Amino acid sequence: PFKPRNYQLELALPAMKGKNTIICAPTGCGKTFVSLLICEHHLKKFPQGQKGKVVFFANQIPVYEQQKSVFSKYFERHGYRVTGISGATAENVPVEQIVENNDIIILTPQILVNNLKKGTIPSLSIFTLMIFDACHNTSKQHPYNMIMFNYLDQKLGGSSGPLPQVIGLTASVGVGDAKNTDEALDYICKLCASLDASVIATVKHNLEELEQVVYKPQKFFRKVESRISDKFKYIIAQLMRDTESLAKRICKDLENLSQIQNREFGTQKYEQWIVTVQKACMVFQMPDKDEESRICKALFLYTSHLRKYNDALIISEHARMKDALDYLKDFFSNVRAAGFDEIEQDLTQRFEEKLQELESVSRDPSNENPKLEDLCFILQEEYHLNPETITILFVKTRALVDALKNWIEGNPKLSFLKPGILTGRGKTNQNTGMTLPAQKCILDAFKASGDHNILIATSVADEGIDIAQCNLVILYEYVGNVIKMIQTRGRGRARGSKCFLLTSNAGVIEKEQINMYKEKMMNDSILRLQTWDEAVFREKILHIQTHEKFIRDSQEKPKPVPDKENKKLLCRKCKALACYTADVRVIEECHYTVLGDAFKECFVSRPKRAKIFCARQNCSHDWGIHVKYKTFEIPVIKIESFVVEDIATGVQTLYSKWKDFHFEKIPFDPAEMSK
Template identity: 40%
Template sequence: MLQEENGHGIASQHKVTLSRGFVPAPAMVSTSAIRSQSSALPTSSPVQPSTRKGSEKATKEMPDMMKLQDQQQNKTKEQMGNELKENQDYVENSGEDKNSLLESFEILESRILRIENRQALEDTRKPADDARMDTYTDPTASTITAKDEVVTDVSSVDKYDKEKDSEQKEGEGEDSTEADSEDDTVVVSVPAEAATTNGLNASNGAEPLDVRVDDVAEKEKDEGCEKMTALQAAKPPPEQQKLKDIPMRDYQMELAIPALEGRNTIICAPNGSGKTRVAIKITRDHLDDATGIEGACVGARRRVVFLVNKVPLVEQQHNAFREYLSPKYDILPLSGETNAVLPVGETLPDYDVIILTAQVLENALRDELITLDTFSMLIFDECHHCQKNDPYNAIMTRYIKQKVEKSGTRLPQIIGLTASLGVGKAKSQKDAVEHILKACANLDAEWISQVMEHKYELQIYNEKPVEEVKAVSGRIKDPFADMINMIMEDIEKTLAMEASKHLTPEELKPPRQREKQAYEQWVVALARKSATLPDNVISRTIHAATTHLRKYTDALAINAHARTKDALQYLDKFVTGLQNEGFDDTDEDLVKHFIEARGKLQEYAADPKYSNPKLDQLKYLILKAYAEKPDSRCLLFCKTRALTIALLTWMQEDPALCKLNPGRLVGAGASGGMTKNQQVELLDLFTTGGRKIVISTSVAEEGIDIAKCNIVIRYDYVGNEIGHVQTRGRGRAEGSKSVLIAGREGGNVLKEKLNTIRERLMETAMLHVWNMQRDKHDDFKKEVQRLQDESKKERDLAKALKTLERKTKKICGKGMKLLCVKCKEFACNVSDFRKIKENHQVVVDKSFSQRIIIKPHPPKRIDDWEMDGKVYCKNCRQDWGIQMVYRKASFHTLKIESFVLEKPDGTRLTCRKWKKAPFDVKDITPDDISGMLETPEEDSEEEEMLYY
């Protein structure tokens, strides 16, 4: 039982009982050694026979050994390692039975590794208050103390540090030891804290449990070749493993049947129909049926991976699986942030179900920390992402390659979940069918499961939200936008004069509508061309002008969708930032336009007659909905992070809307992003009503399951047909509404109509594919195979081209260097770069630190590296990238778009992405890492690279 008192949890105790009379030796003893006869080892061996008589005899014959046992109470992991080495030396010089001793020493070494794993795992979870523990020991055995620990191997017991007195440290438990003279056993008390570590829910009322080594051995024998893992050993007995029934409707069982039969299956059903519950049912049946006769991984231990594409979904799906699979099965939630401190290769095989982001699994497969045949089932949530360069597709590419090249290899069963497979760029039913079959090929699926027989029941329980489109005209008069357009026109004229000698009139001619995407594309293209000019002064002028134009474009967008006040604040922040750092004569001339106009702009921002009609419509809809149903939950989608800030500020300053306690949800990117914990906390508040409205970017478009969410508003937010289905599906409550508020001038009303047409095209194509797989399944499989073969040819061609390109890059990159895109100062040579795990290009030149300044950034761990600073040009304060810590060494990983590449002949070019860089980057070596750990004496006096 987990009781709470003054906020502190007190965990109940669960006992794990070992074999009678077992006496721990300096090295730990394996299960097989415990089961062996007492005569198996000489009495002079450090590993004694497992009887009380033998233990007493050993005590008399080896007083030094017993003394050593008494001293082991305060051993640390380091001391255990030293003992391991000493015992290994003893074995080499001993004439005793070395095999038995070596087995014990190997288990001691394994024990050290498990302690490291456990510590790493505990670091990823919310710290719990220490539990009071009682430890019972055999009178002849050394004292064993367990605190906040799951027993990692019932076949081995060693000593732990005694707990400090509770008066010395608040919240720590006390240890007590007593002799059990009637039952010669060693018992280790284990707290039932987390279902994810020992399979017990501390709040479920489970009684203490005893697991004997003999029972474990019997279970190992029954289960076959695999030995018991640490988590299996700590599981409750079968009579205490009763699981909560999974309530399944008929249409949900219809969706599950193909997968339950062992087929690779795509499950396609509307949002809110219970696809996650179907996945849990499939998972539980798969784990229960360890001796399945059909499907993948026959005869193997069952391990299921549930893959998600966004970090906030890890915790949500973990909670859903835990409800129906604990305490019988062990479940681990894992994302890039928690993976940073876990040894993936050693951790994942210990769990029955792992909920993780796809990139974590792809990284582990890429680094050969784990293999696909470790698992018996892979479930892809939102599986329509399995295409092109998505991590889902990278995993499945490995799967299909292994299936073809290693015929007969044991592979996991594949399950995909989605509400919509989409139609891609299809303009006809034939093309739409091809797109859906391509999705089957990517997931190696032999069946698409849809609700056909129980459609009526689905309609009853899965009511489609009511959809509305509110087309709103913009402001009748907008003097703020008129004045911003005048400023932008003046800057364009300056550009035309300054750059006329280097660029053509066509290149300098801007699009007429500055609020359209075409204008932003023109600005970006102009900035890239100017970066390559040999005249640094003109290049700097154009760079500054295009930077200002982009900010004014952003301000126009904010003004169009939010308040004029918010757009003015955005420009104020930009100008203030320029003045604080990196402000030169060129920027000063450009800023004058804004300074001169600011007074008028402020007047327009304060005048209520220039309020935004779209905001008025949004406020009306929100207040109306909450007047009708005060306990409503509203998700408000918008395009950009800047707009989420503007809308949140507007709501917080509005007397009526602020009562809803609005919140903001965005992704985990570096610029204004949110951590996983912040995202989870916000969604918890949204669920419980702490925040009744959340403003979000596309991060909440898929997978977020808020049962009470009944209002979805898309604020000039229109994607493709999949996004149309997904955003609408966030409304889960009865009587839900999905509303699009769109400006008449933006074209989003027309896009919405096209998405509705494409959704109908998709439904028709899905029905065609379903009939095809039912009536002509062989033809269906042949088409899937054809598309897989075509994909393989494309991959092989891409690989050959990449190899050729790499050879070319090695030649082209010789002597090339990087210059700051803004001030053209030298940054580094391309030969100074190294690549870490395909994703991070870092500088290994120690002198590079003299050309940068570092600004602090909250530490953020991703996989096995940590971001701890932002890197800027020392000369002009241009953002160059981030500082990362990898294997205890600091590296600077740069954004290539922040630089100009200069060849030995002086010609210059730009590059927007590292994969398009015209030079090859070598993989990092241990020497590179050690070199960055060393600090040359001449660097010791460098005081300019300070954190500020």
């Protein structure tokens, strides 16, 4: 067995006395071993004829798997039964039997929330010890806070039932939105009241060993200037002005559709303005249907082109011009392949007029982003000293990951790097996700003397996922809150590590400095909190809990009533009628389908399975997809592709999700498909 260190025993001492404590310690010091020692001590203390039950909470699937493996390997000699339940192993055996027939259970919090809501698990008195991993998430409406709401409701209710001991592990408690030390202390007291903790455990008497184990890197700040001359922006701005004039020609009241004033090309404000203008122009209703459809389609096309131009400008701001030009070229290829009509022909011709000059400018070596030059210089200088350096690079968007991988591959001066890619799992409109096996494979590859020595990743590599030690951390316009600042800096635990922040905006550096001051405030508040008498702390925590319980008991609100009137669904691009709400059927309360032979004439299928589009020529707006249910193969529609119009009043409305649209939902009937 592994020999515990002195500071690990110091951290575990308050928990071995039966107190609810929060354990704060740097990442990489071995808090999992501390939890193992606490669990071992807890299970052995019960007298003959009595047993204890331990539940461990993890927020991510890989963390859950690793913890289950570690616990099973550790406690198999003692004769304890260890199991785990998650999304991939939930609907197999009843949860109550699994809980009753085991000693140590590893869980994702949502499973326990679901089973507490259904009534499968009537109370938390079955467990004798609860362990929360990354316990700083116990706030607002997190599942951790739902479990703690159940716990606190049982506690402050007069029910004379035993309750488990609660242990939390974290590397940073955070300050919330505190500005001074008093507010930080108030926030930390609130967090302690959330977990019912009366002790905060830190390393005091064995600091030298911890500093010998975990090393804190040095933080640097680099500020660069923007491009002096930008012909790319000039050309795109001229095109954007021409498109705005074309839009104003058709709609004379364009400038009164939004209240945003003094908009500028290539900013988030302009994006918000154009989104609002798009949402305003898709509602216009006029007595003549053909001319209304013409105007609406024209405005749709104009606004879409303006939005794409703004996106290209932003991409060019944060990356090379080649990436923005490729983005525009892909959009224009899709537009050409997506219903070429006279307005689309005009827009495409106007773009091809300036395409040659755009391609000429982006290939000039003297127009490169200064941020890229600074990053290349940093990488060269760092890898010259240590050829065995391991690096991690943090970025904001999924497109930047691919752009920087391409730039690194194509850079003749960075031939010593082997980039790796790490993004999230969810699928976006422009990007596909990453599966768990792919992430695991790339993480296994990314190590010293391996296939990769530099990793480009989004915020997926912030928490939970384990990564080999890095001697270099680089932040590319990457600043968040104090918790994220502590988490990102903790990945460079190798001795002599450095952390760099790269930006061209002074506000980012100012915010990082404010974060560095907030960390000192938090440490001061924690140090002050430990000098109080425990009874006073208990009284304050009880008062906070009582107030919060009263507020949350008074906050509950009811649900309104849906509307039974019939409605029409119209194509969002061309305003053509698609179907009525009387034809809509719901499959298993989560799939929406349209029944009837009239709807089959309003769409066409173009090949996963085939999607469905608007049948009207030159529109081809996306409406949904074909799915398989039992024997039937039926299409499903998306509410965000249609405009909802009332039959009587005639007012048109927009919805983004099916739960916002309140109408009578008739369940799907297999035998109904005969009328």
